[PDB]
Amino acid sequence: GRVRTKTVKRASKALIERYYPKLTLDFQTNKRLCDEIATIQSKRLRNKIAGYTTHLMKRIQKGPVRGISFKLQEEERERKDQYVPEVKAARSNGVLNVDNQTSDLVKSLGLKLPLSVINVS
Amino acid sequence: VLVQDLLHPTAASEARKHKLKTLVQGPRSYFLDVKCPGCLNITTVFSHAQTAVTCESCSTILCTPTGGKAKLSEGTSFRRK
Amino acid sequence: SLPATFDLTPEDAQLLLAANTHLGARNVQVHQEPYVFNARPDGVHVINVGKTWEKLVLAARIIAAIPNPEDVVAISSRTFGQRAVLKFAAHTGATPIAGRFTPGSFTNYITRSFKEPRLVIVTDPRSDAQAIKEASYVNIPVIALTDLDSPSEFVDVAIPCNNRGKHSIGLIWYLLAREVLRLRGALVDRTQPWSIMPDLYFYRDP
Amino acid sequence: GSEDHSFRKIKLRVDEVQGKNLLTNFHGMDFTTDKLRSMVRKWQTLIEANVTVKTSDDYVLRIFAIAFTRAQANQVKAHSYAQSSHIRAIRKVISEILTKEVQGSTLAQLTSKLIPEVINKEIENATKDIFPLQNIHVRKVKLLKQPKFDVGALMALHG
Amino acid sequence: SQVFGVARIYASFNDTFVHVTDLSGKETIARVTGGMKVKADRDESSPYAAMLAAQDVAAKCKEVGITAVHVKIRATGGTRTKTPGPGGQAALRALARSGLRIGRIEDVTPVPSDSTRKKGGRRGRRL
Amino acid sequence: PKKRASNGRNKKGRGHVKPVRCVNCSKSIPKDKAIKRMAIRNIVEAAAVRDLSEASVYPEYALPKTYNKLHYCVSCAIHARIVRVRSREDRKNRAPP
RNA sequence: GUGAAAUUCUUGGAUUUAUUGAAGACUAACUACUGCGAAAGCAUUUGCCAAGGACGUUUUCAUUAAUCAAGAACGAAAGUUAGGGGAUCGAAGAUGAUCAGAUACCGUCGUAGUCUUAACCAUAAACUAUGCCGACUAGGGAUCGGGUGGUGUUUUUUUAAUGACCCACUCGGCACCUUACGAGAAAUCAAAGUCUUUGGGUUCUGGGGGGAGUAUGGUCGCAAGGCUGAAACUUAAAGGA
């Protein structure tokens, strides 16, 4: 086999960076396009670049595939980034839990603890 | 550690370290003024016996010798000194 | 720095008696922790029950050392955790690093999630063995959250708790921070409660 | 009939006939083998017993009390060893605990101290006030100098 | 409602025994050595001689009214191996195949508490 | 070469030891170096045990074991592929698997 | 019993099993980059017997110490001398195997010896194939033995107490990793470093390869043998990485 090659991958993997947008999976619409872009030798070589690409946009959609991002996947990570609201505020169990041996340094260090704690295994 | 006062360190680090290195050497053993219950008498015994001493004369017994420290009997106040 | 109430108030013997943090371990008391109240004749070490407010909240001025809290993290790789350290990363500063730590992430310019800190921290110093070493290196202070169990060479301060199952791993960082924030930040100064629960804080899915 | 002694066999010998019903007198005791060679592990102390003995029925019997250390329930270290002097003290205990359940005697009266493994108990409670111990057998048990027949001293063992 | 002859099997190497007796064994009955059921003379310890051999043990035990059986395995043993040869396995399964009942199984391999100096010579057996 | 910071085997403070004879070599050979293993298996095997708790007169008995240790020369230890040759570095290991 | 064999035991019922016995032999697993000894070398338990290292030490004496031709203890095993012991292994001897031969390899038996008392011998790859004293260079993280400190970890008994533990520190080990600023023919080496910038103290050894650690004398031993140690003759390489 059927086992892909560099020249090919590393020609689709360079391409896939810029042209994700023209970008497709009917691969017979890339084939044409993949000439206007690359400056390829051959007809055979060219039909094995786009074959690979279509093996990217058929799995991209399905999810986050690897070591390749194209200004479109990277802005859905500043949009997916963020989250939990409210931040940490205990009322419900108010007093925040503070080992009960957690009183000595901070009696020897501050101002206000609204604390939770283990009277003695 | 790049440095340290070894003069006076902690009190800690001595209590644990070995008798013969606290710098100036000093013993651990120390003496222990015993009322057997009967008499008031008060015999000056040592923490590490080697001898059991008798109490004063009552002929009583006191404190058996073991590896290091006596095991003293039941009666004995054993205030230290 | 003796202040006022950071001091125990009307509830700091009531809320960790349903959660266990005074407790130690089975037949195990590690020479390397003042950080065990005695030790009973029937089973088990009643961790001293007054000195964790001594080296879990050194542990809060030392930073106060962040100008920028996402450096102030939480170190991990457990199950009950990935829901408190991920999470110490959300409500304030920090890249979470539970699950992947990211080995190197502090050795060595060649990796992925990039580190160059000045006091990191560390749940289980048995699960987090590389703030004691990725520090015995070059210049990266550390702080272990030192049960009866934590090789103490080079994590220079104590942070004791209990992790034999259950909650208090996650639900203990919570206290590193609250009280780090009440030096510098944005919350409020005896009490006007604190709007979560220690019963958000537990699992996400088993 | 039972299945708790599932191991361990009885050596019996025919003393005399009748009818075709050959009666029997006790010969000796055995463990299965196997269960002896199993209970032993690597990693831990092994001990040993023995003591001969004029019963009175006037039989001469030698007994073997194998016995191990067990660990503690709660014991870092991988083990469970002994010290040695403690073992010296361990074997001497056993000697008396067995002459004593042998004078207090007979084979018949002795036998039903082997079936319900009651000597095994008596060991553990004089021993605890030392050391922990486990497994504690009697392993054997064999005859030597059994005296004259006495048909019914044996025919009184039946009805 | 059954009677019990005792087995009295053994397989080193180069031979094996199916050897029924009484349960006491001062008397004996149908004994069967390997070579007997194989004249190649080669494999005298064969996973087979044993096989057709055991079946002799339920021909001449289901002859003189041995329903059923208790069953002993012995190595060589001695100084030797204490690694049971072919035999005893094939026998222990052919004996179950021959109507026979089975009861109480256990090794007996003669173990020593040392002493008898083993053969070969220091520098060993060697090809 | 030295090979082997012990040497071969297990001996220190201890000067000289009571040797052992090989099950297999049938050589002699001190109880350090040795290389000991418990097989332990069910006398029974897998295939038959089904025809055994079948035709037994036992409504189950259990399945009694078969104890033994096993002594080896180092030669016959490799010939018979018990111990192998661990590269140089995978030596200074000490794990069952 | 084996690669596969055969010699060998087999109504005089072996091989197996049960339990007891007897004997001499050894000290399993634990048991390791760990222990102590001048080295050889030393592991079941406890009791005497005296020895010793390391620390600790606001004890002491005060240059007494370093290496050592002479000389003198110890010295694996083998082996010897005469008694005891003589299980197991097992040169020698016998054997059956394999093989063109097989006096060897493989198998089964087997004196002698292995073990001990008392006396010899003094060699070894006696190996870190690295003389000891010292003094100075560059990082670590382990461990054994001490000692010091931490309202240090458990023990819980009421708090301590110790003890195990943790960590901090150290002195003395037994090693290890990593660098190479250095050294080297290199392989590698915290010592084989501080050496053409050539020198801290001192005892042994070698000067091409063989002939040969022989012949000789001289000497220690009962003997095996050791220590001492030539030359004639021959030869352009023998060797290291």
Q: What residue ranges in E1-127 does DSSP mark as E strands? A: 10-11, 16-19, 31-33
End-to-end distance of chain A based on CA atoms, in angstroms?
64
Q: What residue ranges in A1-121 does DSSP mark as E strands? A: none
- Nearest CB to F56; choose among E102, E122, E126: E102
* D73 touches C: beta carbon within 8 Å: no
CA distances C170 to A65, C77, C146, C160, D67, Å, are: 32, 12, 16, 14, 48
Distance F88 CA to G183 C1' (A): 28
Structure tokens belonging to residue D29: 């005791």
Place of tokens 């289980």: C124
How far is Cα A117 from Cα A102, in angstroms, rounded to an integer? 8
Query: What is the full DSSP assignment across C46-79?
Result: ---TT-SS------SSS------------B----
How far is Cα D143 from Cα D59, in angstroms, rounded to an integer? 8
**Are the CB atoms for E124 and F26 separated by under 8 Å?**
yes
* F41 touches D: beta carbon within 8 Å: no
| Region of residue D11 (phi > 0: left; psi between -120 and 50: alpha; otherwise: beta) | beta
**Are the CB atoms for B59 and B43 separated by under 8 Å?**
no
**Are the CB atoms for D76 and C27 separated by under 8 Å?**
yes
Interior angle at CA D52, CA D48 and CA D54, nearest 5: 155
Residues paired with residue D25 on neighbouring β-strands, in sequence order: D13
Distance B73 CA to G22 C1' (A): 53
* Closest nucleotide to C40: CA versus each C1': G156
Q: Which residue is nearest to nucleotide G150 (CA to C1')?
A: B12
How far is Cα C158 from Cα C52, in angstroms, rounded to an integer? 8
Q: Which nucleotides of G are covered by protein (CB under 7 A)?
A: 1-6, 10, 13-36, 41-47, 55-58, 76, 87-91, 105-110, 128-129, 140-142, 146-170, 175-176
**Are the CB atoms for F56 and F12 separated by under 8 Å?**
no
Indicate the residue type of C108. Answer: N
**Are the CB atoms for C193 and A91 separated by under 8 Å?**
yes
Place of tokens 């007997």: E36
How do strand D24-30 and strand E10-11 relate by DSSP bridges?
A: unpaired
* D32 touches F: beta carbon within 8 Å: yes
**Are the CB atoms for A100 and C22 separated by under 8 Å?**
yes
CA distances A55 to A5, A24, A60, A61, F55, Å, are: 14, 10, 9, 11, 62
**Are the CB atoms for C72 and C94 separated by under 8 Å?**
yes
Distance D112 CA to G50 C1' (A): 56
How far is Cα C96 from Cα C81, in angstroms, rounded to an integer? 11
Q: Which residues of A touch C179 (CB under 8 A)?
A: 106, 110, 113
CB contact under 8 A, D32 and E108: no
Task: Give the minimum alpha-carbon distance from D75 to chain C in angstroms, rounded to a whole number.
Answer: 7
Number of domains in chain B: 1
**Are the CB atoms for C35 and C160 separated by under 8 Å?**
yes
Helices within chain D (DSSP H only):
85-92, 107-114
Cα-Cα-Cα-Cα torsion B7, B11, B12, B15, nearest 10 degrees, comes to 110
State the SS3 of B55-79.
CCCCCCCCCCCCCCCCCCCCCCCCC
> CA torsion sign, A43 to A49 to A53 to A55?
positive
Interior angle at CA A37, CA A33 and CA A41, nearest 5: 95
**CB-based contacts of A24, cutoff 8 Å, min separation 6:** A30, A54, A57
- Helix, strand or coil, per DSSP, at residue D9: strand
- Nearest CB to F68; choose among E82, E89, E104: E82
How far is Cα C2 from Cα B33, in angstroms, rounded to an integer? 44
How do strand E16-19 and strand E31-33 relate by DSSP bridges?
A: antiparallel
Structure tokens belonging to residue C89: 């990363």
Please state the length of chain D: 159
Place of tokens 């027949």: D149
Distance E116 CA to G86 C1' (A): 12
How far is Cα F22 from Cα F67, in angstroms, rounded to an integer? 18
Phi first, then psi: what are they for E97, rounded to 5°? -75, -20
Residues paired with residue E31 on neighbouring β-strands, in sequence order: E19
Domain ranges across chain C: 12-206
* Closest nucleotide to F5: CA versus each C1': G33
CA distances A113 to C10, C17, C172, E81, Å, are: 11, 19, 15, 76
**Are the CB atoms for C111 and C102 separated by under 8 Å?**
yes
CB contact under 8 A, F67 and D34: yes
Place of tokens 């095997």: F45
How far is Cα E19 from Cα B6, in angstroms, rounded to an integer? 85
* C95 touches A: beta carbon within 8 Å: no
Domain span at B15: 1-81
